[PDB]
Design a protein around this ligand. Structure first.
Ligand code: FAD
Ligand code: FMN
Ligand code: SF4
Ligand code: SF4
Ligand code: F3S
Lengths: 1472, 319, 117
């Protein structure tokens, strides 16, 4: 994977550009996916300029006369199987080109070499040809390009008319050409030998290679595209296509003319995200703008509210943000207009981009700093690209614009200042809105009768609403979800329960909303859409809101401002209408809306205040969805807005789905009425009503940001109307008709069931006297409320059976479990074989089955030490595996005790926080595990309350005792699938024996991701369910996130069997397993190993108190207190008996069916049938999508290989061959080698050998030293231990010093380089991620997110970037230069010194948890002095030497940054 | 405050009167909580999911809900929630054996931290509602044109009568004794259950609109077909009164009395009526040696009411 | 692709239910792939059946006419969104068609349903 570009600055063609482009493509084979075939690739492409001399010579040879003006060439992919569709395509192309009047010279067959393509990329290979078109009309060049663009668009439309397949036009221009295909990266100049000619010379070049997630290549999907090249992924593609459909109905420009009609569906069908973004980019460029302006408009910068940028740029970005919705996602872009050549980044800066300027007037940018070979004595400046930055080259003038210079040159075209001031705000109107006209609050009886009509219980106001008004933050739950799914219940579950939220797996990282909050906006605009192809003042005249949610006073003020332009629509249907009253009401409202919009109205208010004893209220979700979809399909949405007044919104999940469906603003008045009525009774204490409303709105805003952040979307504008949810339990027809773009894998209730539920609840509310709301059980069990998976009798029976060791009692327990009405998806399935029963004593032995169960990870922060030790003792006794979870483990238990117990854990986890990951913690296991997402809370980090962190856990995690620890939602290491492959390579290098497990969460589209991670050499996939327990997490994330594991597992199995990849990995599942029937069902679906989890805790004494977070669990399971931990009653015999009973039940079932092994039943789907609940529920659930049986072929239906998937050997092997006297005698050594950027994990296997031999601290510092010269690759010296010293002369790419554990790394420029050390980037991104001890001295500027999750390391660098020292927990760090924005975000341990000259640190720092001062104590000056002296000694810098020379006057320039939590814990206080 | 105080408090029931003082009188032995101590003892509950305190309560009261609404003042809403699902909450809190139904199963009892005093808090938050006029009769809104009959004035009879009258029907009770209330007024003694709250609840029922038929035997003074033809439906709640016996050498001697008649005469004398079996008869135990047979709470009440009236030596024989 | 299947199913279900008929469900035809060659297997489609019942009580000829119109409109719709490899071998209440790209004598082996009584 990788994108890059090369450009001659002066703008003159030369062969060296293409030569270096090919050389750079020849050296990216290590980031791609290898194959056992060796010939199969997954895409490659290059994009260069047209060599006029070549084609003019060809035309001369044919017999024509070479024209004077530039010649045009187009490359086409025609069908290959049928020799008639080729002629039809040729006829179409020729009759369309000759329609404008241009002259066709002829066709040419591109010479190729097919002997190097694989077997699958060759069966779908198209026929490649070129067409030569000359400009005989003498028209200009820009008009020539415009005509060629229009010709290509109309040709595409025409060939799509007659339904001809396998036709593509890779490029059609007179300036540039594209050579791309589905071959290997290094085999490009072999498949296309034309590039070996001496006449292919250009002044720019772009190159790209991708990393696919499936194994069915399609040639028209490889990059680069026409005028773009993208590396990464776009989050909002289902949300941007809709707004593009809405914008298409008004855009026009006088350049195209009548042919504008042939450009209406600008985004075709069957493209990828990088194809859609490219199409819109090109249609915006061809209309007059230039590449920098289009990049600024499509992918903007972070509109920070700071004074570090001039307000000229602020006005510019304001206009660009007001004109168009952003296109989010991790993205490195390398685009090229006809004139400019631009390289840019996204808002967050997740992908890397590094460039280099030479003295030959050459700029080279890419993903790595060692792709092309350049001598050090000829470079001028090395650099990087921050978040939102860009660098451009102007070829027509021959100039190089860096970031700020390009911004200044771009901010001089139009007077944006006089245009932006046309906007108006709302808080001003709320202030000028006189405090009169406050209506009367509804009576208690009316309030109760309106609340009963929606099913609101008394716990909905005493558990999840009181915290919002009281503190301003959502609630916290402490256990998994055990409630029935929405469609299988019998009470009234609102329509907002059928929609589960989404998140992002390894293919996409989430965003931290607690620290990186400065790049997330909740702005709203009314009266915004217009023609996006002009430049005027009417585009910046609108109403602007700072939040989509509104109170009642703000809504009344907005209504008064709107006046007679809005239209109020009723949303009620008659209760006595009939069996189809809801459908008629939907049709009525969706016709009245269209009738009112055409009549000049520009605001649609969807009010349902008319709910009475004879009119039921339509669910707001369905109504707003119908209205928005109808306005989209009728070319009217761009005219008006859509404001909703709902009477059901109480929590942050309702507003989320209302805004995701398409509503603009949402006002919830019933919640405000309840708040006022609870305040007038004197329940909140002494706070005024305004304080309650402010806290409630703040809680709603933070909840919206948290929900929107689980996906990677950082702006509300590009998230609205995109449908980022999943419908479970709804009909396919209803979903496909009323909702824009959502998937409903299994069907559900239609409109009749919804009408029945609504009418029944409304009758219950309005036909009987209500005296008080029902108590209600949804989060806690109550006799009146719903049913639960864990009830009293079940728990007591299980505990008695496990304690007394009686199989009959456990069978009674399993019967009680399997006799309740259906509550999950696996309850509607039934086992039915056709063989004859076999005697029970013939099936596999109980041991051979117990060795298939494991216990999932439960961190030592959540559990007590005794419970963790008990589980680990029990599992290591029967032969199966256990898990330690995050939070590390105690090293003293790394040995069997005197009695014979083994308190260790056979599976170590690698969480997001890297909480205890060291070099010895990884060499004491048999299987590693990469936790991407948890079952309960997906796309979010695990939490740990403050008081739960005692001194023991503080020492165990290397943190501060008594402070809340929240892991970051992303990994900062896994930003794409190639990053996951790199991390797997690192983990397989540090431990030469373990197997790498990847943990996922079931959802829609998990099959492609699982097929992707299977190519990354992982051998175990884990599919967690939506019902998994947890130690602490919010309620909205527990109840409304995830999917049942039956969908994810059954999809992953099918997708892996389809790609011939199932026979290499093992599948594992967990979440909601209680009896053996569920185990057999999961084995039938495809799983092979099983995780138990919560049931284990119930065998040891847990009684589902659900108070784990409050640190007062009675039985003492999840507590850190002493007097409660004295109440532990656990015993390993209990867990052993539980596992024994569970295995015996599976033996019984297998004997009853007629098989003799779990191998004979894995994958055999035909033994499962679906039975309906009856003829009174009428739910149309069809489970056939999960019962589909793909035929495997000649391979088996499970893993049939031993050992791990091996990886290619790195440089370390050679080192192990040489440093033999170190391992045989223990003597100092000294080695020197040559480093290259295609050599990953330099010095990790040696670290494993040293850790196994001497230990982490057995050798003196600097026992073995290695000297490398050149550009080191990725993960330089990951997980190195004390005694290893790597010294690099040159620069390292990425992840340098990851997981350092006492080693030493020194990076310095070469001796023969004319470069200032403090003005050139030397290391890359994510430096010292989660290190625990050691040193690192660099002699340049670091990259992005410098020293994240540092715990014990001491680093000295001469610069930094954005988000430096993010969430640092311990150690010291000196920075001799400028820093980036959001410095020291979430820092909670350690100390920092910054050498700041221009007095600008108060403008960049995030003064939330840290304080910055001047150095005042000599005890702290001696530390800095010694640190800088050691830096000068090691790296031999000149800037640091200059600082040390003038010490007395430069000591007064340093800023000392100290956390707030370490102000009363330091020995020597920092103050006087 | 956040009610998770089972960690830094200790269970303590309300104040009990010493043994040297209980033997004399016939009043109760416990006392109502003080507000400062009830507000603290109700703060101990853990507000646990899957509340075992509710699973094992035959009426299934929402114990955590009013246990919470008590710890923050707001006693009116707590009384409302408690009364919404149990007709006789004070009688229940006074006589329900809690060591096997409610105080014997909640999560902090299995953990040997001591159990929440549920019955005493029930008594507290239900008796303090009388002291402020919060209790009101459940008169039917719209008078319905039907009549229902019930046989018996015990707990089941009174509960069914109150529910039927709240529905809107018209009810007629039929009791054998002269004072209605079942063996709540004649069987259970005066130290366990005071005879004032019983008549208070019965007077509230009478105010609701029920009709009382005292001194009316269903066997003698009427017949099942007659009452069947009178109303639309009849509810047999006559209870159980045929006592067991023992046949052995000497089972025909004198001063061998049954327990129910003894308890009935004791309750009558505690009310008055100067029944002659107390003055000159074997139903007094002033200075005699008493021995009771059989076990259970019946024998408990008998032995206690015997040791109350002097009874120099009393013994109990269980098998 | 496991997504175009869902789009096709959505189209079929939203078009059949547009007339008012009642859908009983889908069924996966049991087959035996071990007898097809190498080229006729690389382009093999997924074979399924849909069961539609006549609940409106309409006549049989009108039933066949409605089924014909439904099939035509489904074909037009699925051709609208440019989805490939979709076909409706038959849709009626009178006759059915079992066809494929196997050998002539291997028919009752690929489709074992015809071996039923
Ligand atoms: C803490 C506690 C203590 C207890 N103590 C005792 C005790 O000391 N003694 C004891 O016996 N039980 C005792 N019990 C038993 C318990 O009270 C009973 O289970 C409960 O009272 C049953 O009441 P009931 O609905 O049967 O009505 P009962 O209380 O049995 O009253 C039934 C009513 O029907 C009337 N009746 C009876 N026959 C006729 C008829 N032929 N015609 C018309 N009316 C008729 C009776 O006079 C009475 O009014 C005790 C229970 C508890 C929990
Ligand atoms: C108290 C507790 C702590 C947990 N900690 C972790 C954890 O640290 N990492 C993790 O991946 N899963 C964690 N889990 C989830 C379990 O690993 C597992 O996915 C879940 O318990 C399965 O749910 P089940 O027991 O109902 O089958 C935790 C669960 C609980 C209840
Ligand atoms: S009574 Fe017991 S089970 Fe019920 S809430 Fe209190 S502690 Fe929990
Ligand atoms: S004391 Fe009250 S709450 Fe407890 S079991 Fe008896 S009636 Fe139920
Ligand atoms: S659910 Fe949690 S609060 Fe205690 S009783 Fe079990 S560990």
């Amino acid at each position: 994977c990788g994108v890059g570009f090369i450009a001659a600055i002066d703008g003159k063609p030369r062969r060296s550009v293409v030569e270096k482009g090919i050389e750079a493509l020849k050296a990216v084979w290590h980031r791609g996916a290898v194959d056992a075939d060796g010939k199969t690739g997954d895409g490659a492409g290059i994009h260069v300029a047209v060599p006029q001399k070549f084609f003019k010579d060809h035309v001369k040879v044919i017999g024509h006369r070479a024209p004077d003006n530039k010649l045009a060439v187009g490359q086409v992919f025609l069908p290959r199987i049928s020799l008639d569709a080729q002629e039809a395509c040729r006829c179409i192309v020729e009759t369309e080109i000759l329609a404008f009047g241009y002259y066709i010279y002829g066709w040419r067959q591109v010479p190729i070499n097919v002997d190097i393509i694989g077997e699958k990329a060759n069966a779908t290979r198209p026929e490649i040809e070129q067409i030569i078109v000359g400009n005989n009309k003498g028209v200009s060049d820009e008009q020539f390009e415009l005509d060629l663009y229009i010709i290509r668009r109309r040709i595409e439309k025409a060939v799509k008319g007659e339904q001809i397949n396998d036709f593509y036009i890779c490029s059609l221009s007179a300036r540039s050409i594209i050579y791309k295909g589905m071959f290997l990266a290094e085999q490009l100049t072999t498949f296309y030998p034309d590039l070996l000619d001496e006449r292919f010379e250009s002044d720019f070049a772009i190159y790209h290679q991708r990393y696919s997630t499936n194994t069915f290549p399609t040639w028209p999907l490889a990059q680069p595209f026409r005028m773009l090249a993208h590396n990464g992924e776009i989050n909002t593609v289902k949300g941007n296509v809709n707004w593009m459909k809405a914008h298409e109905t008004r855009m026009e420009h006088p350049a195209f003319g009548t042919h504008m009609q042939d450009l209406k569906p600008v985004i075709g069908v069957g493209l990828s995200d990088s194809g859609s973004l490219d199409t819109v980019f090109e249609v915006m460029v061809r209309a007059g703008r230039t590449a920098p302006m289009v990049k600024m408009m499509l992918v903007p910068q972070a509109l920070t509210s700071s004074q570090t940028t001039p307000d000229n740029h602020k006005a510019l970005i304001q206009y660009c943000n007001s004109v168009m919705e952003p296109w989010d996602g991790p993205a490195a872009l390398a685009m090229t207009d006809g004139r400019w050549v631009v390289g840019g980044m996204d808002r967050n800066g997740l992908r890397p981009m590094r460039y280099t300027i030479t003295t030959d007037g050459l700029i080279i940018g890419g993903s790595e700093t060692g792709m092309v070979k350049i001598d050090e004595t000829q470079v001028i400046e090395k650099g990087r690209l921050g978040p939102g930055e860009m660098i451009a080259v102007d070829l027509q003038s021959g100039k190089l614009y860096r970031d700020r210079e390009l911004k200044d040159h771009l901010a001089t075209l139009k007077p944006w200042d006089k245009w932006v001031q046309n906007t108006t705000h709302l808080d001003e109107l709320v202030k000028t809105a006189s405090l009169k006209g406050e209506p009367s609050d509804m009576d208690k009886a009316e309030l109760r009768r309106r609340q009963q009509a929606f099913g609101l219980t008394m716990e909905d106001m005493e558990l999840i609403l009181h915290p919002m008004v009281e503190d301003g933050k959502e609630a916290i739950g402490s256990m998994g979800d055990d409630s029935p799914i929405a469609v299988l219940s019998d009470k009234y579950r609102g329509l907002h329960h059928f929609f589960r939220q989404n998140f992002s797996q390894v293919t996409n990282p989430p965003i931290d909303s607690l620290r990186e909050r400065r790049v997330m906006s909740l702005k709203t605009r009314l009266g915004n859409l217009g023609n996006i192809l002009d430049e005027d003042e009417t585009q910046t005249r609108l109403l602007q809101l700072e939040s989509p949610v509104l109170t009642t006073a703000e809504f009344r003020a907005m209504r008064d401002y709107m006046g007679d332009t809005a239209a109020e629509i009723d949303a009620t249907f008659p209760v006595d209408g009939g069996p189809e009253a809801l459908r008629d009401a939907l049709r009525r409202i969706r016709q009245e809306t269209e009738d009112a919009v055409r009549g000049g109205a520009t605001h649609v208010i969807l009010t349902d205040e008319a709910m009475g004893p004879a009119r039921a209220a339509i669910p707001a979700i369905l109504a707003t969805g119908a209205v928005h979809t109808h306005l989209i399909r009728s070319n009217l949405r761009t005219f008006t807005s859509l404001n909703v007044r709902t009477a059901e919104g109480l929590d942050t999940h309702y507003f989320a789905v209302l805004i995701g469906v398409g509503a603009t603003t949402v006002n919830a008045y019933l919640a405000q009425e309840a708040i006022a009525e609870r305040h007038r009774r004197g329940l909140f204490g002494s706070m005024p009503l305004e304080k309650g409303m402010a806290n409630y709105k703040k809680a709603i805003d933070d909840g919206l940001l948290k929900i929107m952040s689980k996906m990677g979307i950082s702006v509300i504008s590009s998230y609205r109307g995109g449908g980022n949810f999943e419908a479970i339990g709804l009909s396919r027809a209803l979903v496909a008709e009323h909702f824009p773009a959502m998937v409903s894998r299994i069907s559900g209730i239609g409109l009749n069931g919804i009408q029945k539920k609504v009418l029944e609840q409304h009758a219950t509310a309005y036909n009987e006297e209500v005296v008080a709301l029902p108590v209600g059980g949804f989060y806690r069990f109550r006799k009146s409320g719903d049913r639960h998976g864990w009830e009293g009798g079940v728990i007591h029976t299980l505990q008695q059976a496990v304690t007394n060791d009686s199989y009959t009692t456990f069978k009674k327990y399993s019967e009680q479990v399997n006799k309740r009405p259906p509550m999950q998806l696996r309850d509607l399935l039934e086992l039915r074989s056709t063989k004859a029963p076999v005697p029970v004593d013939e099936v596999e032995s109980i041991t051979a089955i117990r060795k298939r169960f494991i216990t999932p990870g439960m961190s030592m922060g959540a559990l007590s030490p005794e419970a963790h030790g008990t589980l680990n003792v029990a599992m290591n006794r029967i032969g199966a595996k256990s898990d330690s979870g995050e939070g590390g483990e105690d090293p003293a238990r790394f040995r069997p005790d005197k009695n014979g117990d083994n308190w260790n854990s056979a599976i170590k986890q690698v969480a997001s926080g890297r909480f205890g990951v060291t070099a010895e913690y990884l060499n004491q296991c048999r299987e590693l595990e990469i936790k991407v997402a948890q079952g309960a809370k997906p796309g979010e980090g695990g939490q740990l309350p403050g008081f739960k962190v005692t001194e023991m856990i503080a020492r165990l995690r290397h943190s501060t005792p008594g402070v809340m620890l929240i892991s970051p939602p992303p990994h900062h290491d896994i930003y794409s699938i190639e990053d996951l492959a790199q991390l797997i390579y690192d983990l397989k290098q540090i431990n030469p024996d373990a197997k790498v497990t990847v943990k996922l969460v079931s959802r829609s589209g998990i099959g492609t991701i699982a097929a992707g991670v299977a190519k990354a050499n992982a051998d175990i996939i884990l599919i967690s369910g939506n019902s998994g327990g947890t130690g602490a997490s919010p309620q909205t994330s527990i109840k409304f996130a995830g999917l049942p594991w039956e969908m994810g597992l059954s999809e992953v199995h099918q997708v892996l069997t389809l790609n011939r990849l199932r026979h290499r990995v093992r599948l594992r599942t967990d979440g909601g397993l209680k009896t053996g029937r569920d185990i057999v069902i999961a084995a039938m679906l495809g799983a092979e190993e099983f995780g138990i989890g919560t049931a284990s805790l119930i065998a040891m004494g847990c009684i589902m108190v659900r108070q784990c977070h409050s640190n007062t669990c009675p039985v003492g399971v999840c507590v850190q207190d002493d007097k409660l931990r004295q109440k532990f009653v656990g015993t390993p015999e209990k867990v052993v008996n539980l596992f024994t009973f569970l295995a015996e039940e599976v033996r019984e079932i297998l004997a009853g069916l007629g098989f003799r092994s779990l191998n004979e039943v894995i994958g055999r789907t035909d033994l499962l049938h679906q039975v309906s609940r009856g003829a009174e529920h009428l739910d149309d659930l069809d489970l056939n999508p999960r019962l589909a049986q793909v035929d495997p072929g000649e391979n088996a239906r499970y893993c049939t290989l031993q050992g791990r998937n091996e990886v290619p050997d790195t440089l370390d092997a050679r080192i192990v061959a040489d440093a033999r006297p170190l391992f045989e005698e223990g003597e100092k050594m000294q080695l020197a080698y040559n480093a290259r950027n295609t050599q990953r994990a330099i010095g990790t296997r040696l670290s494993s050998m040293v850790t196994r031999k001497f230990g982490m601290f057995g050798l003196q510092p600097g026992h073995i030293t290695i000297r490398l010269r050149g550009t080191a690759g990725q993960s330089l010296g990951a997980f190195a231990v004390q005694g290893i010293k790597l010294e690099v002369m040159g620069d390292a790419n990425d992840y340098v010093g990851k997981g350092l554990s006492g080693g030493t790394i020194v990076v310095r420029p070469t001796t023969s380089s004319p470069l200032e050390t403090n003005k050139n980037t030397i290391i890359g991104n994510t430096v010292l991620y989660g290190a625990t001890a050691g040193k690192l001295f660099a002699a340049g500027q670091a990259g992005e997110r410098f020293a994240v999750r540092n715990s014990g390391a001491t680093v000295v660098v001469e610069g930094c970037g954005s988000n430096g020292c993010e969430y640092m927990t311990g150690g010291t760090a000196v920075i001799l230069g400028r820093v980036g924005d959001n410095f020291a975000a979430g820092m909670t341990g350690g100390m920092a010194y910054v050498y700041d000259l221009d007095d600008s640190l108060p403008l960049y720092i995030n003064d939330e948890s840290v304080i910055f001062q001047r150095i005042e104590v000599g005890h702290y000056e001696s530390q800095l002095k010694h640190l800088i002296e050691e830096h000068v000694t090691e790296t031999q810098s000149r800037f640091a030497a200059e600082i040390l020379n003038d010490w007395a006057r430069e000591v007064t320039k340093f800023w000392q940054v100290v956390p707030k939590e370490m102000l009363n814990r330091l020995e020597v206080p920092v103050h006087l | 405050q956040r009610m998770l105080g089972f960690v830094h408090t200790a269970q303590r029931m309300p104040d009990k009167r010493p043994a040297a003082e209980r033997r004399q009188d016939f009043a109760e032995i416990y006392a109502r909580f003080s507000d400062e101590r009830a507000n603290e003892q109700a703060n101990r509950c853990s507000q646990c999911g899957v509340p075992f305190c509710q699973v094992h309560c035959p009426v299934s009261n929402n114990i955590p809900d009013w246990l919470k609404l008590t710890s923050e003042g707001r006693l009116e809403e707590a009384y409302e929630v408690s009364q919404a699902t149990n007709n006789f909450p004070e009688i229940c809190g006074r006589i329900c054996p809690q060591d096997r139904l409610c105080e014997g199963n909640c999560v902090i009892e299995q953990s040997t931290h001591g159990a929440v005093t549920i019955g005493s808090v029930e008594k507290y938050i239900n008796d303090t509602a009388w002291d402020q006029g919060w209790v009101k009769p459940r008169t039917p809104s719209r008078e319905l044109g039907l009549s229902v009959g019930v046989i018996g004035a015990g707990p089941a009879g009174l509960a069914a009568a109150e529910e039927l009258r709240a529905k809107g029907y018209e009810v007629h009770v039929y009791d054998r004794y002269d004072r209605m209330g079942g063996l709540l007024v004649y069987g259970i003694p005066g130290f366990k259950l005071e005879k004032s709250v019983v008549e208070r609840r019965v007077k509230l029922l009478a105010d609701a609109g029920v009709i009382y038929h005292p001194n009316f035997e269903v066997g003698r003074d009427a017949s099942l077909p007659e009452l069947r033809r009178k109303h639309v439906a009849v509810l047999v709640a006559t209870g159980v009164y045929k006592a067991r016996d023992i046949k052995a050498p000497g089972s025909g001697l004198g001063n061998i009395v049954a327990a129910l008649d003894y308890l009935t005469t004791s309750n009558k004398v505690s009310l008055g009526d100067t029944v002659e079996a107390y003055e000159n008869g074997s139903l007094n135990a002033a200075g005699k040696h008493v021995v009771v047979l059989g076990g259970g709470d019946t024998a408990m009440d008998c032995v206690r009411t015997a040791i109350r009236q002097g009874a120099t030596s009393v013994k109990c024989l269980y098998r």
